[PDB]
């Protein structure tokens, strides 16, 4: 009752923004966030490759729609890239036609709006690429910080010039192959979405950047059981089993992740079992005092990792024994993180 | 032999610097401010609560009109707030949700957003089409962007997890100055009320005074026991204060070339995430990872008050240009405007 005509309109704007945020939030909720940590060459690929072995979880239909959106974004970057690359040269070239400058203006005007692919502007990149002067300046232009995938932005003009796109994997690889920082894998499983964040070669301080990720559904940690007899290459006095345990101990007890679930995958259990009969665990655990039988060797190692948890009464540690020829390896984590999420929301309400 | 001889020279030079600083410590602040009237019991209260973020808040910055704020959270969107009416003016989608920093351009025409992708995106808000678009993508850093601040239109300074800061020419999209010499990752920047001078802190328990135009470090300040989390200038531009993981805030003076004060208490074991001064410079604010913000008497190091209300770690703290109100934010996804 005190607002001006404009103040009321401004309030409607704010409410419509809240509406869009609320809708976005509901859409946002479904994906499971998984953080993948552990030692290098640890059988992590076996987990990932197996998820990638089936390929049922391909580019989703909806995801394909996003890709059509990705192609539109990359196509706009392609057409501005070629008219920009030829306008920023240390050595200029003559154009095959004086009309090319008018084409550049049209591309730069359309790219400035950054809406959608225009067929006439798709014609420009096709003609500029054929023009020997535009191609000739590439050998000088490529001296700058160009995207390694930049060749695809131009070379694919034949298909990304077509208003009706058919998406492919290259359409997102253009930006994924950059491999900058943490790189997540986006996949689905039984109508659930997942993003598993692959952390490798972080350097710095192992635990400083990560704190921000508190709230991740689970941390995924991998150990290769059959490699217990190998000594760490970086430090010839340390067995690889102890390097994995030091990482586990320093990660699982981080105050940033007090009750965050951990799912421990112990890989190569079959090669492990067929080796403990020849080389007792005392090669890496001299304190081991058991027989060369799986139920004792596998239980000992599991216990050694579980005894690294200083919050046993708060953080649950899941253990699964994997091999290269199984289907439970991928179903386990699917159900396990679903149960973690249910356990978490039951904790939040205090019902549990 | 050549390497050791340089080490020998470095050892003598470091001792000469320390001795030059010790010779200037002719008084302690406890001998100077002893008879100043106290600030007394300061009870700040929330006047606005801003709701809408669906994720942990990591960045918040005051606009120069004292009315608008820009904030960013891990939900991958920027929001421009009208602090007077708790209205959302803009909501800007990001192409990467992993945001660490944002900045409100002093002219109000642009905002910055950066993060784990090592690229600072400059958004044009004062558009004719009605939407908000990225004008430039300032790529070329090799580490995460912990902080970015505008200096002027088309001029921005960025930090990096690659330990090097850079001054960007936004219109051309190129680096013009790089600031090398830090040992650890750069955690935060602060600009003086003079765009030719700023300070930075990094994960090496050292703060450095940088000359924007020369690109040189002019002073190095030490004393922290752990990584520096936040830095800000004293309002007069001749001093600054830092916070760190050692739960002590420290006050340094450029011309005295030494630490002047420390702010701590036996019952504080919590890290500092943000610091700022009030308009007069008499009240020192700091946010902590224990969910609260404190109020320190900048001339005595006594406790003057507590700002409690957040239910999670404090991530953002700052004061508006006219000193009228303080905004804070935390990992509980709310912003609060105090007083």
């Amino acid at each position, epitope marked *: 009752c*005190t607002l001006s*005509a*404009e103040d009321k309109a401004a309030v409607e704007r704010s409410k419509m923004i809240d509406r869009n945020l609320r809708e976005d939030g509901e859409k946002a909720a479904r994906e499971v966030k998984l953080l993948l940590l552990g030692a290098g060459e640890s059988g992590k690929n076996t987990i990932v490759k197996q998820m990638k072995i089936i390929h049922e979880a391909g580019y989703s239909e909806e995801e394909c729609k996003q890709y059509k959106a990705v192609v539109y974004s990359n196509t706009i970057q392609s057409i501005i890239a070629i008219i920009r690359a030829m306008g920023r040269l240390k050595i200029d070239f003559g154009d095959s036609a004086r009309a090319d400058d008018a084409r550049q203006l049209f591309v730069l005007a359309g790219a400035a709006e950054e809406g959608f692919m225009t067929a006439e502007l798709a014609g420009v990149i096709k003609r500029l690429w054929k023009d020997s002067g535009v191609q000739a300046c590439f050998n000088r232009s490529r001296e700058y910080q160009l995207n390694d995938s930049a060749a695809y932005y131009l070379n694919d003009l034949d298909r990304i010039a077509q208003p009706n796109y058919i998406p492919t994997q290259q359409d997102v690889l253009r930006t994924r192959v950059k491999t900058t920082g943490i790189v997540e894998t986006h996949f689905t499983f039984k109508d659930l979405h997942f993003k598993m964040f692959d952390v490798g070669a972080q350097r710095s301080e192992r635990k400083k950047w990560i704190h921000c990720f508190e709230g991740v559904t689970a941390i995924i940690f991998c150990v290769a059981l059959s490699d217990y007899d190998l000594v760490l290459a970086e430090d010839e006095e340390m067995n690889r089993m102890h390097a994995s345990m030091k990482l586990f101990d320093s990660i699982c007890n981080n105050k940033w992740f007090t009750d965050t679930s951990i799912i421990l995958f112990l890989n190569k259990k079959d090669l492990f079992e067929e080796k403990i009969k020849k080389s007792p665990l005392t090669i890496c655990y001299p304190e081991y005092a058991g027989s060369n039988t799986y139920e004792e060797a596998a239980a000992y190692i599991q216990c050694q990792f579980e005894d690294l948890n200083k919050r046993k009464d708060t953080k649950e540690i899941y253990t699964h024994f994997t091999c290269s020829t199984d289907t439970k390896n991928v179903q386990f984590v699917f159900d396990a993180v679903t149960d973690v999420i249910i356990k978490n929301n039951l904790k939040d309400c205090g019902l549990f | 032999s050549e390497l050791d001889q340089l080490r020998q020279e470095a050892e003598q030079l470091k001792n000469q610097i320390r001795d030059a600083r010790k010779a200037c410590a002719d008084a302690t602040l406890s001998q100077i401010t002893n008879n100043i009237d106290p600030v007394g019991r300061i009870q700040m209260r929330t006047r606005r609560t801003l709701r809408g973020h669906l994720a942990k808040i990591y960045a918040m910055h005051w606009g120069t009109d004292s009315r608008l704020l820009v904030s960013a959270s891990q939900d991958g969107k920027l929001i421009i707030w009208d602090s007077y009416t708790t209205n959302k*003016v803009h909501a800007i989608p990001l192409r990467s949700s992993w945001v660490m920093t944002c900045a409100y351009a002093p002219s109000g025409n642009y905002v910055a957003c950066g993060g784990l992708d090592n690229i600072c995106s400059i958004y044009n808000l004062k558009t004719r089409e*009605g939407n908000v678009r990225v004008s430039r993508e300032l790529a070329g850093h090799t580490g995460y962007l912990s902080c970015c601040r505008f200096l002027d239109d088309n001029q921005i300074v960025t930090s990096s997890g690659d330990t090097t800061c850079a001054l960007w020419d936004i219109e051309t999209g190129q680096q013009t100055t790089t600031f090398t010499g830090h040992t650890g990752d750069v955690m935060s920047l602060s600009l003086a009320p003079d765009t030719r001078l700023f300070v930075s802190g990094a994960c090496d328990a050292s703060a450095k005074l940088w000359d924007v135009r020369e690109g040189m470090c002019r002073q190095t300040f030490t004393g922290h026991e752990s990584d520096i989390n936040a830095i800000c200038f004293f309002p007069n531009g001749n001093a600054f204060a830092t916070g760190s993981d050692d739960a002590t805030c420290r006050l340094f003076d450029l011309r005295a070339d030494q630490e002047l004060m420390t702010y701590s208490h036996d019952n504080i074991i919590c890290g500092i995430t943000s610091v700022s001064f009030s308009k007069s410079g008499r009240l020192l604010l700091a946010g902590y990872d224990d969910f609260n913000c404190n109020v320190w008497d900048a001339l005595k190091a006594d406790r003057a008050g507590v700002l409690a209300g957040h239910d999670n770690r404090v991530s953002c703290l700052g004061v508006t240009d006219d000193g009228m109100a303080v905004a804070t934010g935390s990992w509980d996804s709310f912003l609060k405007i105090w007083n």
Partner: single-chain antibody
Amino acid sequence: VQLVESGGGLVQPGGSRKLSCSASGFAFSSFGMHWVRQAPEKGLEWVAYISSGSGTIYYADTVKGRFTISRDDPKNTLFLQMTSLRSEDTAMYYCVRSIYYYGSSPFDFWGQGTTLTVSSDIVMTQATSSVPVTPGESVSISCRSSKSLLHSNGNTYLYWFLQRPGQSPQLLIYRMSNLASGVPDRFSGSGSGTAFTLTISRLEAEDVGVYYCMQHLEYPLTFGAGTKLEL
């Protein structure tokens, strides 16, 4: 940013017609729209408003019950459906773009105009309506309101427009002192209460036209008759 409206022509009394406007070049779905119609004998008259969202629509009382405004975002098309048309409805109809938020410019872009031919609050006032001016001289004009235009929030909601021969109106000044984009700094204004002024430092040939002032404090919206700053 372009807004073109077509669909006019001549009708008989009591009939109906639909006008439309095709938008391009801007975030159509984020903007509201006004219809403003210009009668040769009267000048600008406000007709209807649709919010950038939905559900909030206003009509002038002179068209209420006969006009319907609607918007279809998927086709960037605005519609105006009119029935029971009368001779009084003969006017040039403009689509006017408007967006509201802190610091917005509510009347920045205007369309070109569609002619409708039919066969057969707060009142703004002005003095003189035709001040002779020579290029190179300064100009000072003013208008008055029947109601104070100052809101308790500290803002005054007075707008100044210029229309040149053969052109649609363009915005010069909004909320007393703020210039619209593209407006030379020759233009300024000030005032208080119910009396406000517009100043031109130097009269240039491009400044010759009819100036309007209007309030945007409360609905309905109204216009002054217009002052013609010709030599």
